[PDB]
Structure 1
Amino acid sequence: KPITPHYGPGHITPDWCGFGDARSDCGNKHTPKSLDIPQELCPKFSSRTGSSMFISMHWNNGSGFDAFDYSNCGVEKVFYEGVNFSPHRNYTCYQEGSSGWVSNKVGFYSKLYSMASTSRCIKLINLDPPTNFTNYRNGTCVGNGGTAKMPDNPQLVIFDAVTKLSTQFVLPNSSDGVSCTKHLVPFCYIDGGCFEMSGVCHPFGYYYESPSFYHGFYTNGTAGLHSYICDYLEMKPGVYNATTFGKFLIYPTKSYCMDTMNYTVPVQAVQSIWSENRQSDDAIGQACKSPYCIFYNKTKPYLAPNGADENHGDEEVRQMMQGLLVNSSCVSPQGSTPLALYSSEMIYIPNYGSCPQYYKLF
């Protein structure tokens, strides 16, 4: 008899892991009512209430951000986080607005997922401070009346006078047992032409460089609307310079350290949103794209009648996450199956394992 895939994430061997927020964090005081996964699976997730891998990339604890040192290893990976940076947050640093932050978010998650498919371990690490320097200020946001906290990573600095300056930073090749064969590192900038301070409109730009790497940004057009934009870079371990065009410089203070596995396996991501009385975004659906990521979308709103509150304990995702309880043979966008000859519907890519073939063909 042909088998019907269980819509939702799955795993074909015990070497699998998850990344999450409150909805997979057994440390939460409302556990198990606040969970969207089975409680027996919490030990498989690296998760913290209030956090997301995007938040933790850019911010330390404070000014409204709950940061977490995410760290896990698995050939197979399930991501269920992202919601803790949605338009609901009402954050802007310059004039990019909420949608500017949805764009940064898509950028981050797109790079994370594609890199994670080539990796087994993923670990947020702190970088050593750069070679010392002088006569500078840290950057601030003008957004939200100056209350918006600019990222701690990368760290922007502004020199007291126009200067020539290159400072050195290091991406390590390991972190307490994990090999960092590559790093996900942010590079952010403020576009919109020259940047006005105390009556002088300065060229804005800087770059990362080494003998085998370059990435930079520069503008000196007429001043217009300014936007804080981030690029997410894959960088090898080693020594780099951050270099100024005169007034501005950034250096990274954190990275996601990843190792490399030789067989690429698509990651899985589940739609991470709020209930309908808050502004969510579709950043996860935009970032989780074939062929590197298998997206399990919600077809209903986030509804938690048996949960801790209206934003924690969704029935649909709960049902989806029942899939992680079985030892499957096949993982696909249609969901998971045990070993079987025939499927009740066509299984498409991206998939992996041993997948049943659509019965009507035979």
Structure 2
Amino acid sequence: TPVTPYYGPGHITFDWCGFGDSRSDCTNPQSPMSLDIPQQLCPKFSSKSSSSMFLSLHWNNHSSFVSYDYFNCGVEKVFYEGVNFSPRKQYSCWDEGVDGWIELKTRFYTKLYQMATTSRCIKLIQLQAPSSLPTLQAGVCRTNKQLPDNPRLALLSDTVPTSVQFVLPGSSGTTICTKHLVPFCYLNHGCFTTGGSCLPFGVSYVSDSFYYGYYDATPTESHDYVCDYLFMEPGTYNASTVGKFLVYPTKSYCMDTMNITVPVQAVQSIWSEQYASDDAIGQACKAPYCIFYNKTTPYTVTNGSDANHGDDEVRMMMQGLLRNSSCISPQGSTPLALYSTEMIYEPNYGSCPQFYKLFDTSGNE
């Protein structure tokens, strides 16, 4: 019989998982009023109030940073977080401004979703400190906001070219790490004046089979904190420097491999209209790796815990996760059928119905 896509995420198999924030955290004291998902799906989500996967990559816990050890496994994946690092927060570190950090956010989610499509498990781990570390002075932000804890940015007591060794583990607990999502960051725009001269800023991650680096010795002194998010295989690497500045990772997303490529799903994660949101999720979640379900309405709560918890639109969307589905698409989900009442676009997966009008024998069409 004919079917119509149900707008919202969905799952075809039992092997699915969710990543989220307060709006899918049943440990929140206001739950179930504070949920945007059905309460019975809380055990399917790895979620924590006030956190995000981006924020938790870069920061451990501080007064304005709620860091969570995100961890979940599923062939099919539903992401519903991101809001807790938004322009509302007004975070910046050096001269990059808030827009700089919305760009970094977009880069991170782009890579996260990409890597997630060939993984089943995704787990944020704390890396061990390099075994040998010289005397180090912690870096700071020009803004006096909290410097990211990952990657570590620190200052050596001399200008001697140096390497320390870091380990991306092959496993963490029961999870296999066939790959790691690792940030590589640096301060750009020329040499950096400290310890009596304008020192080249040159750092790199290196092994026999890997190189990624930045170098600038070129002559207001301005710098931006910039990051790239790297696919790195398990192994031991050098965090190398041409001198003074040292950057090495302290956390990573450990992922395993599955031998199928399944697009992930992300729902728009924003604040009510009185606060400043971004579209990093929409810009990051693109074909062919990610199926983006945008909101068509503002974040609007009529029967929830406060103005930013219990959106009617997203609640209706998340009902899709309770449905019988064999096809997942940006139009939503359908059970197994021959014909769809509307056109189904990409990315999609499963066994999908074909657009009804293509088979019409009227022929009015």
Task: Give the TM-score range, shorter chain.
Answer: over 0.9
Cα deviation for residue 349 of structure 1 reads 1.4
Which deviations, in whole Å up to 9, do the C-alpha atoms of 1:63-113 show, x marking residues without a partner? 310000000000000000000000000111001111000000011000000
Cα deviation for residue 199 of structure 1 reads 4.8
2:115 alignment partner, SS class? helix
Match for residue 34 of structure 1?
34
Choose 10-19 or 56-65, whichever is displaced more. Answer: 56-65
Question: How far apart, CA to CA, are the structure 1 residues paired with 2:136 and 2:81?
Answer: 36
Structure 1 gaps of 5+ residues are none
2:103 alignment partner, SS class? helix
Contact 1:193 / 1:223 at 8 angstroms: preserved in 2? Answer: no
Match for residue 239 of structure 1?
236
Match for residue 273 of structure 1?
270
Equivalences for 1:321-336 in 2 at 5 Å?
Answer: 321-336=318-333
Equivalences for 1:195-234 in 2 at 5 Å?
Answer: 195-197=192-194, 199-222=196-219, 224-234=221-231
Partner amino acid, structure 1, of 2:226: I
Match for residue 71 of structure 1?
71
Match for residue 363 of structure 2?
none
The aligned length equals 359
Partner amino acid, structure 2, of 1:127: L
Cα deviation for residue 304 of structure 1 reads 0.8
Equivalences for 1:1-362 in 2 at 5 Å?
Answer: 1-143=1-143, 146=144, 148-197=145-194, 199-222=196-219, 224-362=221-359
Question: How far apart, CA to CA, are the structure 2 residues paired with 1:161 and 1:135?
Answer: 10
1:84 alignment partner, SS class? coil
Partner amino acid, structure 2, of 1:86: S
RMSD: 1.0
Cα deviation for residue 219 of structure 1 reads 1.1
Structure 2 gaps of 5+ residues are 360-365
Which deviations, in whole Å up to 9, do the C-alpha atoms of 1:246-299 show, x marking residues without a partner? 110111111100000001000000000000101100000000010000000001
Counting aligned pairs with the same residue, the percent is: 67
2:302 alignment partner, SS class? coil
Question: How far apart, CA to CA, are the structure 1 residues paired with 2:158 and 2:256?
Answer: 41
Contact 1:195 / 1:223 at 8 angstroms: preserved in 2? Answer: no
Instruction: Give TM-score scaled by structure 1 length.
Output: 0.97
Match for residue 362 of structure 2?
none
Which deviations, in whole Å up to 9, do the C-alpha atoms of 1:45-71 show, x marking residues without a partner? 000000000011011111310000000
Question: How far apart, CA to CA, are the structure 2 residues paired with 1:53 and 1:136?
Answer: 28
Cα deviation for residue 118 of structure 1 reads 0.4
2:314 alignment partner, SS class? helix
Cα deviation for residue 157 of structure 1 reads 1.2
Cα deviation for residue 210 of structure 1 reads 0.4
Cα deviation for residue 226 of structure 1 reads 1.2
Contact 1:13 / 1:327 at 8 angstroms: preserved in 2? Answer: no
